[PDB]
RNA sequence: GAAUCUCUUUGCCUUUUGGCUUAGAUCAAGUGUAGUAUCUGUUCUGUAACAACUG
RNA sequence: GUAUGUAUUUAUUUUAGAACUAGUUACUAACAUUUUUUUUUUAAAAAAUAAUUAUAUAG
C-alpha cells in the first residue's frame, strides 16, 4: 500500500538527521542497515555518507586560518586533484576543502539528481509536520524503546500470569474458609525425582561451630520469640 | 521543534509508564525460598544475594535459617568483610550477644590483619561496659605487632579509663614495637601533660641514650 | 584529600561511635569447667541500648540513601537516556570523565 | 581507575550512550616540480622545432 | 540475551566427588601398554639502459599474500 | 577488585580484539599503562595464532585436502582481513616514506612519451562536444554491458533494483541522462565509497570492486568514448594485445606462424641463435603514481577528462567494518580501467623497445603496419629484436643473433657477473610439462 | 566543649553494559479479507427557634 | 507446518469532563486460484494471433 521507492537518494531534512543521530547513539556506528531501516527514503550507504561527511562531531567545520589556506593552495599544487588525500592531510571533510578551494581560485537545475546531498546543509521543516514524518517518528520511538529478547518478554508475561493465578487460588480458599470448609493449599509438583521442597527441612543446614561462650538462654529467648510470632500470625494474621 | 534529545525524552517518558493465616505465610515462604535458592544454585557467587536471602529469613523471625544462610555464605567467600559485619549485626540487633561474641572471636582469629573486625569487637564490649574485656582485647591486639592505629587506640582507651600507671606500660612497649621519634615524642607529650618533671626527664634520658 | 584506605576509615568510624557512646552515656566472668563455657554476667540494659542503637543507625542510613535516590532521580541535566538504568550509567560516565581529564 | 567500557559493535542492554563518546614528505613536491619543468621543456623544444621547420 | 555468559568460575572437581559412580566401560580405557620400561650498437637506444618478530610484517606473510591475491 | 569489576575489565579485551580485526587502533583515553600493555600483549598472541591458522588452512585448501563448506567461508573471511591490512600498511608506508618514483625517472619517462606521441603526430582526444554525432549509439553500447548482468535473475536485492531503475530511466530519456554525464565529466571531483569483496578460486583469491550505480553509468560512457576515439586515432600500436580482431587461440596461432615466417630463423649453419623471452611485468597497476598518471595522460585526452580519471581512483575502500583511502593504487574495477592499463603498458613497451624499434614494429603513421610484418626485410634484420607482443601483464620478445653478437653480449654479462663454479644452470627455470 | 534537626562541596556509586566465529549470515517490491495498535475532527457545560414529654 | 511447553481431583484424616463520526498507517495470519505483437490521429483508424494448471514447502 505504499508504492515502492526503488531509488532512495533524496534531500536530507531535519527529521532524518535527528533520527539518524538518536539511532547512532543506540545502535552504534558499524551497524548501518539497522540505522537506515529506522528512517525510510534513505539507504544504508547514504546513512554512512551522512554520518562520515556531515553529522559527525569530530569533523572540522570552521573558517580556514591563513596557514591552513596557504597549505591548501600548496597541497592542491603538489597533488593534482586528489581531494581525499588532501582532505586527509587537513583533517577536514573533502567537500569543505573543494568549496574553499573554489573560493580561493575565484579571487543545479530542477529535476536533477543531486549526488552531493549527504554533504550539504539540512532543510528545516514546515510548522506542523507531514503525515509520513509523524509515522516515521512514531515507529522510530517504538524501535528505540525496546531492549529485550523474545525469551525475556515471555518471562515478563509468565510472571504476571502466575501472579494472578496465585491470587485466584487464594480467593477460592478464602471463600471456602468463610463457608467453613478448609481446603489446604496444594503444592507445585516436582519436575524430577529429587526436586527439593523448602519448608520440610533447612536444606543444607550449617551449624555455626560453637566457641567458648554460652548460648542457652539466648536460644530460649529466640525460641520464645519465634513461637509467639507464629501464634500471632495464626490468630491475627500478620 | 524536533531534535534528538526531545525524541529520547519522549521515549523515556513512554517506557517509564494479604497474609491472613499461617498457610498463606507458608506458601509465601516456600515460593520465596525456591526463588532465592534457584538464583544461588545457578550463581554460587554474588554475596549480595546471600545477604538479601539471609535478611529475608530475618524478616520471617526465623533466626536458625538466617544463621545457616550466613554460614553457607561465608563458606563461599571468607575474604568478604561486609558479610562478616552483617552477620555480627544480625546477631546483635536481636539481642544475642554471646552468639556474636563467638562470631567476633571467629572473625578476628580468621582474619587477624583486618582492622575493622577488631574495632567492631571493641565497640561492642565498650557498649556493654566491660572494661576488663576491652583491656584484654587490646592486649592481644597489640601482641601481634599490628601498627600504630591499634596502639593509639589502646593509649586512648587507657586515658579514658584514667589508669595513669598503665599508659606508661603501653608506651614502654610501644617504643619497642615502633621505633621512630614520633612515638617517643608522643610519650613525651603524655608525660608533660599527666606526669611529673622527673618522669618526663627520665623518659627524655631513656630516649637519648638509646638513640 | 582523596580516597581513604580501609585501615583509616575503620578508625574514624570507631572514634565516631565512641564519641556517640560518650554523649549517650552523658544523657563478671564465670568459667564452668564441666563444659568449658564462659558465662559473662551482662545487664539487661546496655544490651537493649546496643540493639536500639544499631537499629536506629541502620534506619537513619537507610532513609538518607532513600532521599538521595529521589534527589538524584529528579535532576535530568546529564544526558539523553531511554530507561531508569541508562541514566545511572550515563551519570557514572560523567563522573569518570570529569575527574579524569 | 579503569573507565567503563563502551563498545561500538555490541550494545547488550541497548543503552543510548552519548554521541560524542562512541565516535607530507618532500618527494611529492619534488616530483611535481620536475614534471612541470618537463612540461615547459617539451613546449620550448617543440616551438624551436616548429621554427626550424618553417625555415 | 542473558544466555551468553563469560563463565567467571569453573566446575569444581570437588563438586563431583561425593557422587556415586556408575561403571560403564569405555573404549579408551581397555588394557593397553601394560608394561613399564625403565632407565638403567643496439643496447644504446634505451632511455634507462646503463626476522622482525611480528608475523604480519614479515616476508613470509607478504610472499604468501602476494601469491594468493593475484 | 571485589569480583563484580572483573567481568567489566574483560570488555576491553573483547573490544581490543574487535579493533584488531578491523585495523582500528584501539586507544582508550583514561587507561592505565600496564593494563594496556597486558591487553596489547594478549591480543598480539591471539592474532599470531589467527594468522598461522589462516595460512595452514589455505595450504590444505590448495593441496586438495578435505575441507568443509563453512571452513572455506571462514578462511575467505580471514584472508580478506589479512589482505586489506597489508594494503592499508602499504598505503601508509607510501605516504610516510614518500614516492619511490624519484623525479629523474619521471622526467625521462615523460620525455620518452612526448617524443613518441610527436613521432606519431597524435591528435588528443577532446572533451565530448555538446552535440556529438556518434553519441546516442555509444550510449546504447555503454548501457548494454551494464544491462547484461541482469538478463538472468528475477530475484533481486534492492541494490540491483536500484541499478535496473537507473538503467531503465537512462533508456527512457536518453538526452537528459547524456547531458548529466556531460556535466559530471566536467564538475565532479569527489566520489562515493567503493566496496571491495573477495571471490575465491581455491588456488588464489581475487578482488571485486563494486561502484555506485550512478557513477558506473558515467564510467561506462567514458569507457566507450575513450576506446572508440583512441581506436580512431591509432593510439595503441599493433603489439598491444588483446586486440579486437582476434580470439586468443587465433593470437597464439598467429604468433607461432609468425615465428616461422621470419627470415632464416631456423637456420643455424653459422652458429647463430634465436632467443624467446617471456615474462610478467610484475605489479604494474599497484605501482601507478597518480601525479605521474595525470601528466602522462594529459598528453592524449582533454584536461577535464584527465582530471576525472585521476580523481575517480582516489576513493574510499570498504570491506565490512574497515575503510581506507586509496591513495596510491589503480583500482581495476573501474569501467575505464582497461584503457589506463594499456596506456601505462604502452609507456613500459616504449621503455623496453626504444624509439627506433617501436617505429619499426609500428610503422609510419601515414600507413600503419600489420601485427608481425615489416615494410621491408632489411628493416627486420637491422636489429636483434625481431618480434614483440604484450598481453595484459605479459611480454613476449623474440631475439635473433649472430655468433659474434651473442658472444659479446654474454661477455658483458660474465664480466659484471662471473660464475666460475658453474651454477647458472640451477636457478634456471624451464617447463617440466614437456 | 558538647548533643538534636537541616543544607553545601569532599569520600563512597551503592538497580551504575556478564562469552565465541565468516562485523555469525542474509534482506527488508506481494492482492483481498480479518485481528491488534494509534490519530484526527465536531458539539455541550430540608434547617433553626419556641411550647410538651424523658422512655 | 513442525519442535517444545503449558491446562485437565475424586475415593471427606478426628478440633477539565460529557456526547457524535469516519478513514490512514505499520505488524501478524498453513486463510483465500481480467491475454501477446504494434501502428495512426487528437474517442475514432489500421494490422495481428492462438477443447481448457498444482494438495505438492520447514529450522
Chain C residues contacting D via beta carbons under 8 Å: 79-82, 85-86, 89-90, 92-93, 96-97, 100
How far is residue F143's CA from residue F141's CA, in Å, rounded to a whole number? 6
How far is residue A130's CA from residue B154's CA, in Å, rounded to a whole number? 79
Is the CB of residue B124 less than 8 Å from the CB of residue C77? no
- Give SS3 for A6: coil
Is the CB of residue B122 less than 8 Å from the CB of residue B114? no
- Is F15 near chain D, with CB under 8 Å? yes
Report H helices in chain A.
14-27, 33-36, 44-50, 66-78, 83-90, 94-106, 131-145, 150-179, 216-235
Pairing of the two strands F194-200 and C37-40: unpaired
Query: Cα distance from F279 to chain A (closest Cα, Å)?
Result: 33
Is the CB of residue C40 less than 8 Å from the CB of residue B145? no
**Which of left, alpha, beta for F27 (phi over 0: left; psi -120 to 50: alpha)?**
beta
Location of C-alpha cell 556493654: B128
Residues with Cβ within 8 Å of residue B203, at least 6 apart in sequence = B184, B187, B188, B191, B195
Indicate yes or no: strand G within 7 A of the C-beta of A32: yes
How far is residue E22's CA from residue E17's CA, in Å, rounded to a whole number? 13
Output the nine-digit C-alpha cell for F397: 620478445
- Is F295 near chain D, with CB under 8 Å? yes
Strand order from edge to edge, sheet including F273-280: F273-280, F394-401, F385-390
Closest CA to F316 of F306, F305, F326: F326
Q: Which residues pair with F206 in a beta bridge?
A: F199
Output the nine-digit C-alpha cell for F86: 597489508
How far is residue F328's CA from residue F285's CA, in Å, rounded to a whole number? 10
Number of domains in chain C: 1
Resolution for this experimental structure (Å) = 3.3
Q: Which nucleotide is nearest, taking the CA of residue F22 and each C1'? A: G23
Is the CB of residue F371 less than 8 Å from the CB of residue F365? no
Query: Cα distance from E28 to chain F (closest Cα, Å)?
Result: 27
- Give SS3 for A13: strand
CB pairs under 8 A between A and E: 8
Residues present in chain B in total? 211
How far is residue A179's CA from residue F35's CA, in Å, rounded to a whole number? 71
Strand G nucleotides where any atom sits below 7 Å of a protein CB = 2-5, 7-8, 10-32, 38-40
Q: Which residues pair with B153 in a beta bridge?
A: none
How far is residue B107's CA from residue B101's CA, in Å, rounded to a whole number? 10
CB-CB neighbors (< 8 A) of F207 in chain E: 69
Do chain C and E touch: 3 or more Cβ pairs under 8 angstroms?
no
Q: Which residues pair with F200 in a beta bridge?
A: F205
By residue range, what is the domain housing residue C61? 1-101
Residues with Cβ within 8 Å of residue C84, at least 6 apart in sequence = B16
How far is residue B125's CA from residue C40's CA, in Å, rounded to a whole number? 11
Q: Is D16 within 8 Å of A80 when comparing Cβ atoms?
A: no
How far is residue C75's CA from residue C90's CA, in Å, rounded to a whole number? 13
How far is residue F236's CA from residue A40's CA, in Å, rounded to a whole number? 50
Q: How far is the CA of C6 from the C1' of G9 (A)?
A: 23
Output the nine-digit C-alpha cell for A5: 521507492
Helices B131-143 + B148-160 axis angle, to 10: 160
Residue nearest to nucleotide G2 (CA to C1'): C23
Query: What's the per-residue H, E or C state across chain F?
Result: CCHHHHHHHCHHHHHHHHHHHCCCCCCCCCCCHHHHHHHHHHHHHHHHHHHHHHHHHHHHHHHCCCCCHHHHHHHHHHHHHHHHHHHHHHHHHHHHHCCCCCCHHHHHHHHHHHHHHHHHCCCCECCCCCCCCCHHHHHHHHHHHHHHHHHCCCCCCHHHHHHHHHHHHHHHCHHHHHHHHHHHHHHCCCCCCEEEEEEECCCCEEEEEECCHHHHHHHHHHHHHHHHHHHHCCCCCCCECCCCCCCHHHHHHHHHHHHHCCCCCCCCCCCCEEEEEEEECCCCCCCCCHHHHHHHHCCCECHHHHHHHHHHCCCEEEECCEEEECCCCCCCCCCCHHHHHHHHHHHHHHHHHCHHHHHHHHCCCCCCCCCCCCCCHHHHCCCCEEEEEECCCEEEEEEEECHHHHHHHHHHHHHHCCCCCCCCCCCCCCCCCC
CB-CB neighbors (< 8 A) of B105 in chain A: 211-213
Closest CA to C16 of C62, C65, C57: C57
How far is residue F218's CA from residue F196's CA, in Å, rounded to a whole number? 20
Residues with Cβ within 8 Å of residue B115, at least 6 apart in sequence = B146, B147, B149, B150, C6, C7, C10, C11
- Is F32 near chain C, with CB under 8 Å? no
Residues with Cβ within 8 Å of residue C12, at least 6 apart in sequence = C4
* Helix or strand (DSSP H, E) at A213: none
Q: Which residues pair with A123 in a beta bridge?
A: A13
Is the CB of residue A21 less than 8 Å from the CB of residue A55? yes
Instruction: Give the number of other Cβ atoms within 10 Å of residue C13's Cβ.
Output: 14
Q: Is F98 within 8 Å of D46 when comparing Cβ atoms?
A: no
Q: Burial level of C63, CB count in 10 A (0-12/13-18/19+)?
A: exposed
* Helix or strand (DSSP H, E) at A201: none
Q: Is F107 within 8 Å of D25 when comparing Cβ atoms?
A: no
How far is residue F9's CA from residue B102's CA, in Å, rounded to a whole number? 39
DSSP state of A123: B
What b/e readout covers B11-36, taking b as 16+ CB neighbours within 10 angstroms?
bbeeeeeeeebbbbbebebbeebeeb
Output the nine-digit C-alpha cell for B34: 525456591
Pairing of the two strands F316-319 and F194-200: parallel
Nearest-5° Cα angle at E30, E28 to E35: 115
Is the CB of residue D25 less than 8 Å from the CB of residue A89? no
Q: How far is the CA of B45 from the C1' of G18 (A)?
A: 13
Report H helices in C3-101.
6-26, 48-74, 84-100
Residues with Cβ within 8 Å of residue F62, at least 6 apart in sequence = F202, F203
Q: How far is the CA of F270 from the C1' of G24 (A)?
A: 71
User: CA-CA distances (angstroms) from residue C89 to B9, D13, E5, F27?
Assistant: 16, 11, 21, 21
How far is residue A105's CA from residue F252's CA, in Å, rounded to a whole number? 54
Is the CB of residue F252 less than 8 Å from the CB of residue F384? no
Location of C-alpha cell 582516489: F314
Way it was determined: cryo-EM
Is the CB of residue A40 less than 8 Å from the CB of residue A146? no
Output the nine-digit C-alpha cell for F194: 567503493
What b/e readout covers A140-171, taking b as 16+ CB neighbours within 10 angstroms?
bbebbbebeeeeeeeeeeeeeeeeeeeeeebe
DSSP state of A187: P
How far is residue A60's CA from residue A64's CA, in Å, rounded to a whole number? 10
User: CA-CA distances (angstroms) from residue C77 to A26, B169, F374?
Assistant: 19, 60, 87
How far is residue F136's CA from residue F143's CA, in Å, rounded to a whole number? 11
Q: Which residues pair with A10 in a beta bridge?
A: none
Q: Is A22 within 8 Å of B7 when comparing Cβ atoms?
A: yes
Is the CB of residue C89 less than 8 Å from the CB of residue D15? yes
How far is residue F363's CA from residue F379's CA, in Å, rounded to a whole number? 10
Q: Burial level of E24, CB count in 10 A (0-12/13-18/19+)?
A: exposed
Closest CA to B97 of C44, F423, F16, A181: C44
- Give SS3 for C32: strand
How far is residue F149's CA from residue F158's CA, in Å, rounded to a whole number? 15
Amino acid at each position: 500500500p505504499p508504492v515502492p521507492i526503488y531509488v532512495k537518494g533524496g534531500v536530507w531534512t531535519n527529521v532524518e538527521d535527528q533520527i539518524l543521530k538518536a539511532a547512532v547513539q543506540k545502535y552504534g556506528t558499524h551497524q548501518w542497515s539497522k540505522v537506515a531501516s529506522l528512517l525510510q527514503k534513505k539507504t544504508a550507504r547514504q546513512s554512512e555518507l551522512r554520518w562520515n561527511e556531515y553529522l559527525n562531531p569530530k569533523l572540522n567545520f570552521t573558517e580556514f586560518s591563513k596557514e591552513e589556506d596557504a597549505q591548501l593552495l600548496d597541497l592542491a599544487r603538489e597533488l593534482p586533484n586528489q581531494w581525499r588525500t588532501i582532505a586527509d592531510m587537513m583533517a577536514r571533510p573533502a567537500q569543505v576543502c573543494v568549496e574553499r578551494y573554489n573560493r580561493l581560485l575565484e579571487s543545479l537545475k530542477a529535476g536533477d539528481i543531486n549526488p552531493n546531498a549527504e554533504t550539504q546543509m539540512a532543510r528545516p521543516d514546515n510548522g506542523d509536520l507531514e503525515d509520513e514524518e509523524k509515522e516515521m517518528l512514531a515507529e522510530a520511538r517504538a524501535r528505540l524503546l525496546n531492549t529485550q529478547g523474545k525469551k525475556a518478554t515471555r518471562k515478563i508475561r509468565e510472571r504476571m500470569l502466575e501472579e494472578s493465578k496465585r491470587i485466584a487460588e487464594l480467593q477460592k480458599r478464602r471463600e471456602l474458609k468463610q463457608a467453613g470448609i478448609n481446603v489446604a493449599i496444594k503444592k507445585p509438583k516436582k519436575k524430577y525425582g529429587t526436586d527439593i521442597d523448602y519448608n520440610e527441612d533447612i536444606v543444607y543446614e550449617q551449624a555455626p561451630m560453637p566457641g567458648i561462650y554460652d548460648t542457652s538462654t539466648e536460644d530460649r529467648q529466640i525460641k520464645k520469640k519465634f513461637e509467639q510470632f507464629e501464634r500471632k500470625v495464626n490468630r491475627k494474621g500478620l | 521543534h524536533v531534535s534528538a534529545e526531545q525524541i529520547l525524552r519522549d521515549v523515556y517518558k513512554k517506557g517509564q509508564k494479604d497474609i491472613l493465616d499461617l498457610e498463606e505465610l507458608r506458601e509465601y515462604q516456600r515460593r520465596k525460598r525456591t526463588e532465592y535458592e534457584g538464583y544461588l544454585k545457578r550463581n554460587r557467587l554474588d554475596m549480595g544475594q546471600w545477604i538479601r536471602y539471609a535478611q529475608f529469613e530475618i524478616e520471617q523471625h526465623d533466626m536458625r535459617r538466617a544463621r545457616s544462610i550466613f554460614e553457607r555464605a561465608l563458606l563461599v567467600d571468607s575474604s568478604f568483610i561486609p558479610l562478616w559485619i552483617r552477620y555480627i549485626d544480625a546477631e546483635l540487633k536481636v539481642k544475642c550477644i554471646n552468639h556474636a561474641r563467638n562470631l567476633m572471636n571467629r572473625a578476628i582469629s580468621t582474619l587477624p590483619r583486618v582492622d575493622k573486625l577488631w574495632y567492631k569487637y571493641l565497640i561492642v564490649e565498650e557498649s556493654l561496659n566491660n572494661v576488663e574485656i576491652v583491656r584484654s582485647l587490646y592486649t592481644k591486639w597489640c601482641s601481634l605487632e599490628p601498627g600504630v592505629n591499634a596502639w593509639n587506640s589502646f593509649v586512648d582507651f587507657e586515658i579514658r579509663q584514667k589508669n595513669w600507671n598503665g599508659v606508661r606500660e603501653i608506651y614502654s612497649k610501644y617504643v619497642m614495637a615502633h621505633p621512630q621519634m614520633q612515638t617517643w615524642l608522643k610519650w613525651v607529650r603524655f608525660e608533660n601533660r599527666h606526669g611529673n618533671t622527673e618522669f618526663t626527664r627520665s623518659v627524655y634520658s631513656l630516649a637519648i641514650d638509646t638513640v | 584529600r582523596g580516597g581513604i584506605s580501609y585501615d583509616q576509615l575503620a578508625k574514624l568510624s570507631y572514634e565516631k561511635t565512641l564519641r556517640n557512646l560518650a554523649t549517650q552515656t552523658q544523657n563478671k566472668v564465670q568459667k564452668d569447667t564441666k563444659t568449658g563455657k564462659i558465662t559473662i554476667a551482662d545487664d539487661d540494659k546496655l544490651v537493649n541500648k546496643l540493639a536500639v542503637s544499631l537499629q536506629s543507625e541502620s534506619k537513619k542510613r537507610y532513609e538518607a540513601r532513600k532521599r538521595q535516590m529521589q534527589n538524584a532521580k529528579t535532576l535530568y541535566g546529564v544526558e539523553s537516556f531511554i530507561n531508569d538504568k541508562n541514566k545511572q550509567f550515563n551519570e557514572k560516565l560523567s563522573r569518570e570523565s570529569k575527574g579524569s581529564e | 581507575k579503569i573507565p567503563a567500557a563502551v563498545s561500538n559493535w555490541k550494545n547488550p542492554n541497548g543503552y543510548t550512550v552519548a554521541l560524542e563518546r562512541r565516535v607530507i614528505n618532500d618527494g611529492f613536491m619534488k616530483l611535481s616540480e620536475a614534471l612541470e619543468n618537463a612540461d615547459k621543456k617539451a613546449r620550448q623544444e617543440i616551438r624551436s622545432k616548429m621554427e626550424l621547420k618553417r625555415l | 540475551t542473558t544466555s551468553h555468559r563469560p563463565q567467571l568460575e569453573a566446575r569444581s572437581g570437588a563438586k563431583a566427588a561425593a557422587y556415586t559412580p556408575t561403571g560403564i566401560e569405555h573404549a579408551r580405557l581397555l588394557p593397553g601398554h601394560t608394561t613399564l620400561k625403565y632407565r638403567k650498437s643496439w643496447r644504446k637506444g634505451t632511455a634507462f639502459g646503463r626476522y622482525i618478530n611480528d608475523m604480519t610484517k614479515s616476508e613470509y606473510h607478504q610472499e604468501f599474500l602476494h601469491k594468493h591475491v593475484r | 577488585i571485589r569480583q563484580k569489576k572483573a567481568r567489566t575489565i574483560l570488555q576491553h579485551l573483547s573490544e581490543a580484539w574487535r579493533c584488531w580485526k578491523a585495523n582500528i587502533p584501539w586507544d582508550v583515553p583514561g587507561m592505565p599503562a600496564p593494563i594496556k600493555k597486558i591487553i596489547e600483549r594478549y591480543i598480539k598472541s591471539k592474532a599470531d595464532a589467527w594468522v598461522s591458522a589462516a595460512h595452514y588452512n589455505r595450504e590444505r585448501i590448495k593441496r586438495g585436502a578435505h575441507v568443509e563448506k563453512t571452513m572455506v567461508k571462514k578462511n575467505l573471511g580471514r584472508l580478506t582481513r589479512l589482505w586489506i591490512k597489508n594494503e592499508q600498511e602499504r598505503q601508509r608506508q607510501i605516504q610516510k616514506n614518500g614516492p619511490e618514483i624519484t623525479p629523474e625517472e619521471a622526467t625521462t619517462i615523460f620525455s620518452v612519451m612526448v617524443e613518441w606521441l610527436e613521432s606519431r603526430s597524435f591528435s588528443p582526444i577532446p572533451f565530448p562536444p555538446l552535440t556529438y554525432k556518434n553519441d546516442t549509439k555509444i550510449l546504447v553500447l555503454a548501457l548494454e554491458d551494464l544491462k547484461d548482468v541482469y538478463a538472468s535473475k528475477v530475484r533481486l536485492n534492492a541494490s540491483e533494483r536500484e541499478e535496473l531503475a537507473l538503467i531503465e530511466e537512462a533508456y527512457d530519456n536518453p538526452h537528459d541522462t547524456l547531458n548529466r554525464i556531460k556535466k559530471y565529466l566536467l564538475t565532479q571531483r569527489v566520489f562515493k565509497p567503493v566496496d571491495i569483496t573477495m571471490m575465491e578460486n581455491y588456488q588464489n583469491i581475487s578482488p571485486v570492486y563494486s561502484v555506485d550505480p550512478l557513477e558506473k553509468i558515467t564510467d561506462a560512457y567514458l569507457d566507450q568514448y575513450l576506446w572508440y576515439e583512441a581506436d580512431q586515432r591509432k593510439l595503441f600500436p599493433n603489439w598491444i594485445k588483446p586486440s579486437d580482431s582476434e580470439i586468443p587461440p587465433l593470437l597464439v596461432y598467429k604468433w607461432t606462424q609468425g615465428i616461422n615466417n621470419l627470415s632464416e630463423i631456423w637456420d643455424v649453419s653459422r652458429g647463430q641463435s634465436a632467443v624467446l623471452l617471456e615474462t610478467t611485468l610484475g605489479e604494474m597497476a599497484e605501482k601507478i603514481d597518480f601525479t605521474l598518471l595525470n601528466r602522462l595522460l594529459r598528453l592524449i585526452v582533454d584536461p577535464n577528462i584527465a582530471d576525472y580519471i585521476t580523481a575517480k581512483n582516489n576513493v574510499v575502500i570498504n570491506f565490512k567494518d574497515m575503510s581506507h583511502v586509496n591513495k596510491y593504487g589503480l583500482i581495476r574495477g573501474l569501467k575505464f580501467a582497461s584503457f589506463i592499463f594499456q596506456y601505462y603498458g604502452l609507456v613500459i613497451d616504449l621503455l623496453l623497445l626504444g624509439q627506433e624499434r617501436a617505429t619499426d614494429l609500428a610503422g609510419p603513421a601515414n600507413n600503419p603496419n600489420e601485427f608481425m610484418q615489416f615494410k621491408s626485410k632489411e628493416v627486420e634484420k637491422a636489429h636483434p629484436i625481431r618480434l614483440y607482443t604484450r598481453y595484459l601483464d605479459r611480454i613476449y620478445m623474440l631475439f635473433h643473433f649472430e655468433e659474434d653478437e651473442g658472444e659479446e653480449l654474454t661477455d658483458e654479462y660474465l664480466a659484471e657477473n662471473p660464475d666460475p663454479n658453474f651454477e647458472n644452470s640451477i636457478g634456471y627455470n624451464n617447463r617440466k610439462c614437456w
